[PDB]
Design a binder for these strands. Structure first.
Lengths: 92, 57, 247
RNA sequence: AGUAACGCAAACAUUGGUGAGAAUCCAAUGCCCCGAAAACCUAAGGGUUCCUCCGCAAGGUUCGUCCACGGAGGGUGAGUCAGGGCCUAAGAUCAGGCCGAAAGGCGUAGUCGAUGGACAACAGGUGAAUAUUCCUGUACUACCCCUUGUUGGUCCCGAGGGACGGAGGAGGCUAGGUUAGCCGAAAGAUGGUUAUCGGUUCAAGGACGCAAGGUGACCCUGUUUUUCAGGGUAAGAAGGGGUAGAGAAAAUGCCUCGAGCCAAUGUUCGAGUACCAGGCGCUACGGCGCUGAAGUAACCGAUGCCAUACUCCCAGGAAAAGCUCGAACGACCUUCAACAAAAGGGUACCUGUACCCGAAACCGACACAGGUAGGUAGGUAGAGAAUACCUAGGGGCGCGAGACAACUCUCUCUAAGGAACUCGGCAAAAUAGCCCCGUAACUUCGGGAGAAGGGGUGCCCCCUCACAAAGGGGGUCGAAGUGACCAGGCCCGGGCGACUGUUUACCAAAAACACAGGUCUCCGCAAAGUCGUAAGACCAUGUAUGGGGGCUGACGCCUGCC
RNA sequence: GUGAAACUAAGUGGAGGUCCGAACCGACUGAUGUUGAAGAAUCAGCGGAUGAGUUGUGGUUAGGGGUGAAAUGCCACUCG
RNA sequence: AUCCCGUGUGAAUCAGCAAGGACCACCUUGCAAGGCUAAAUACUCCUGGGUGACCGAUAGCGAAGUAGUACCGUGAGGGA
RNA sequence: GAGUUGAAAAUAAGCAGAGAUCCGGAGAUUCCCGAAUAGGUCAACCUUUCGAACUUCUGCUGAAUCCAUGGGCAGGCAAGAGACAACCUGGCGAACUGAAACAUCUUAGUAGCCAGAGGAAAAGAAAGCAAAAGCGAUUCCCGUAGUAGCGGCGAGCGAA
């Protein structure tokens, strides 16, 4: 059997995007975009929940904790997909 | 030389191995201390650290 | 050849002194790591020869030890006696002739011989007369005992079927190796001892007052109250194997 | 009582700007300070103090437009860095087991436990707050797929290895520094002058390979054995390889082949259509835009590498996993399953990441003249990490301005004398660096000793030159030449303690304690002694040349009587 | 220098509980400071500074006790 | 004396054994060395009703707001 | 039976006279830590062969040892662990104090510590009191009674 490290309610593993101006800097400059996830999350569970719900090959998943408690995730997509054409569809 | 100052910059890992919750729950005496802490009503019955993260504030 | 894979590694840490942590064997601490040497006291390979290739300094002992090989593939350490020619051959066994360096049970040998490593009963490793010059002689034997004069001026009839390594054990010249550097006592892991006159009455019974205090008590005592001169500290009925104390 | 104080005596001053209001906030120019830091980074700790905007109720020992303060928003990106997913030390917890009113004590396997062992990333740019983390270049780890072979493979077991001390100085080099060459600019209102001012940079890694460095065994010949010239040995290196015994590996014994080996450094690729002085065009005048020269050599020389390299010494210098090799026995799965590689692609686990960290943010209740492990160690003079002044970088110490009373404190000098002061030369003053001469009493013959005491010392010439230091002779100035800082005062006696050390954190550093040495006494191992009702533990994985305990205190003469 | 010893020039070497002196550790004298800048410090000198050294990290002994190169010292500015 | 234990010795079954305050005789009373049982009974971290010659913000619970809180201590704990 | 989405206003959308909000009974969920329990842990985390670990029960196989025991495997809504102010029981168990000192004694078998357990616990059904007369398990209250006593015949202690 292929167990994950922790079973963590995968339709709630992502919470909200970040709409700061530096996030748009990461879109136009990095082909990346910014999500807010819960602390109980992975570079294997978030990375699977982007290539399925969105339909995009994700390059890397750079995560960090934020001292108010919640977790911040810079997800960088592949070169084949612009983050600007996939972020205006959501509302960025 | 130094001063007659007692507490210093010791790591909170070693302060949690002595005054933390595990050595406080590894004895009948220390869990009786937690009977007095929970019986009084202290919001922080130990002074500890965390092996993963620092503080959620 | 150091790192023999016979130095055996893990020990209890240095010259320790802690039972529950309380000082209970006083004046200990300091020095090097002093990694011990697991030597072969009870020779479990009889009637096979073995040469002598190295006289290594054991820091745990007062004497030296030596590395002995075999005709088969093994390596041991034993206490080498006085007269260990390099390359000389030692062999344990029951009928092996007497040579300075080999071992044999206490029966098949004459009387009046220099032996260091003897056993007080069967099966043990090695107990008596194994210091840096400790030599035990044999007075004549008996039915199942053997009167043995061990190096205290003390004789003792003993079980006759005990292993014994015949020879006078070497490194005698530590009788005269002076410790005149005066802090070389601390290199052995031996802290300085304080004296009973210059302590307080809470610590020692001879805690004095003004000046160099005379000893005050009717007898010079230990720091735990027992008289420290002449009072024999020995249980009155243990063995009755010793013939005369002779001391 | 509107009194002391406003927290070192690094020091600020002016012109502008912002505003209602400016010694204090900002900008510029000078001035001044640290510079083995008062600089930069990280361990701990703190926990949001970091950044933009807004505010000046409280805090800032003054003010304030500012803030480590109040409010809103944001910020900490790792396969490679540090820990965990690996391993163990001290130590802890200890299944069973022994013990014990209870709680629990002892203790084995086992498991945790880094301050250690194992394991893969460097350079440039971005940027209000992040950089080995984001972008680009080149890499490297750990598995899968794609091609050749194998029928066994993995784990447990057997072994090698991991694997270790201190001191010492000599090599070979790098890091840095200086000089020269090259390139660009320069008239800096002064008598002359370009002799001036700035660059001269590049890592990890992939390949090739090492000497005049160390190591390579014995004897003779030449030289100071030595660097080298020359001959012989069949083992005499790094290393492999056969066997023999119950002997797979290993270990031991025997035989044989190998004159080389080891590692920093190095050339090339990475690496230039990078970086860089300069000029070229606008200023929200805070910087962006285009183009771009040379990018070498030599002398010093590391406290960094070789290097756990050699030599010497006793006081004799952790453990386990990763790694490598391997038979039997034991558990599981088996053919397109498992194993070993060769190129090529794919995949990349959690936590820490801001900021302060020789401190205003940590610890001293303070924005406290104090403390805090570790790393980098520029120039000149100097032996030097001291010292004096400075580059980089960072500050001007969060009350100022007048005045120039007594008196306190931190310093400087003082006619004549020189301890007359005093409890007492307490404190100050004086000596001070390198070379040469010379050096006594006494002694344990080791020392005293740098005894004491005396002379030279700066700068320009010449020659001898180990042809680098250095010497002699000469001239030149000053009152004064280690001209500043820095940098032994000494001798003669005596008492005690032999000595180096330790001692009352916060009134006593001693003649006190310890010490090497001596002597008495106990102890034969199921030892004595110590802690514990006990089990047991230290003693000790040691064995009377050893382990306790008492007294005395090196060394020399002795230690009397009861 | 004798048939070997005993012993001595001369180099080589780098031992020391060696000496001078930085970091570092400690606190001998003096002044200041005593509602101190500081509940023990500043300034000027001072002792050790390859060791019986100093220090970081993780530990250990806990009060009819521990530890003590022994002062009734220290055990969280508290210790007969 | 009755009752229960430590070491050691160590009985009798109803014609008996134990108690009736050393002990013996007679009488009286009961049947140890096997267990289980509600009620009356003591108290409040509380809960639901009713009261109070109880308090009224220095009182009443430490606490009428963040109350065992801010703060102090390494911690036990102290504490507005 | 008429308005609601807590304190707690405002804003955006709802939910409701085929009955909302709310109240009551029975159920469901209950991340993580904590007996904490898969293993480790520096509590609210990490690693995971995703596991009620351990003890007890049941079942199979069944060492040295023949039967056993130990172990291993498995099942199990699976019994115990942990918490609890005071009272209660059991065990260790003081000292300041009073005696005008103090040791016998008192304070006191109190406080404290540990263990256990219930709304009560302990005890409890006569090998008992009593006295020639009689009662009929235990507990508690009034009384006898501050009596009989006990006690450096002190301080005090004090039944039946």
């Amino acid at each position: 059997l292929k167990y994950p490290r922790r079973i963590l309610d995968v339709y709630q593993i992502l919470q909200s995007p970040i709409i700061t101006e530096a996030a748009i800097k990461n879109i136009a400059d990095e082909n990346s975009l910014l999500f807010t996830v819960d602390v109980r999350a992975d570079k294997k569970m978030i990375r699977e929940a982007i290539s399925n719900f969105f339909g995009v090959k994700v390059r890397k998943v750079n995560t960090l904790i934020r001292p108010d408690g919640t977790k911040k995730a810079y997800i960088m997509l592949n070169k084949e997909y612009n983050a600007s054409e996939l972020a205006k569809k959501i509302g960025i | 030389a130094a001063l007659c100052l007692t507490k210093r910059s010791r790591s909170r890992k070693s302060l949690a191995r002595t005054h933390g919750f595990r050595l406080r729950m590894s004895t009948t005496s220390g869990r009786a201390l937690l009977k007095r802490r929970r019986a009084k009503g202290r919001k922080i019955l130990c002074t500890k650290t965390n092996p993963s993260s620092g503080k959620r504030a | 050849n150091p790192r023999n894979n016979l130095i055996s590694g893990q020990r209890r840490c240095g010259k320790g002194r802690n039972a529950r942590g309380i000082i209970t064997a006083r004046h200990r601490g300091g020095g090097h790591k002093r990694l011990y040497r697991k030597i072969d006291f009870r020779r479990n390979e009889k009637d096979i020869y073995g040469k002598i290739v190295t006289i290594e300094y054991d820091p745990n002992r007062n004497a030296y030890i030596c590395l002995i090989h075999y005709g088969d593939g093994e390596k041991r350490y034993i206490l080498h006696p006085r007269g260990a020619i390099i390359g000389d051959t030692i062999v344990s066994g029951t009928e092996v002739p007497i040579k300075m360096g080999n071992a044999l049970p206490l029966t098949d040998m004459p009387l009046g011989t220099a032996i260091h490593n003897i056993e007080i009963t069967l099966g043990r490793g090695g107990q008596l007369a194994r210091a840096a010059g400790a030599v035990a002689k044999l007075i004549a034997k008996e039915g199942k005992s053997a009167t043995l004069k061990l190096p205290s001026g003390e004789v003792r009839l003993i079980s006759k079927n005990c292993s014994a390594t015949v020879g006078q054990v070497g490194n005698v010249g530590v009788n005269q190796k002076r410790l005149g550097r005066a802090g070389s006592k601390r290199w052995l892991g031996k802290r300085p001892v304080v004296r009973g006159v210059v302590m307080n009455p809470v610590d020692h019974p001879h805690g004095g007052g003004e000046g160099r205090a005379p000893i005050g008590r009717k007898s010079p005592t230990t720091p735990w109250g027992y008289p420290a001169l002449g009072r024999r500290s020995r249980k009155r009925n243990k063995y009755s194997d010793n013939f005369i104390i002779r001391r």
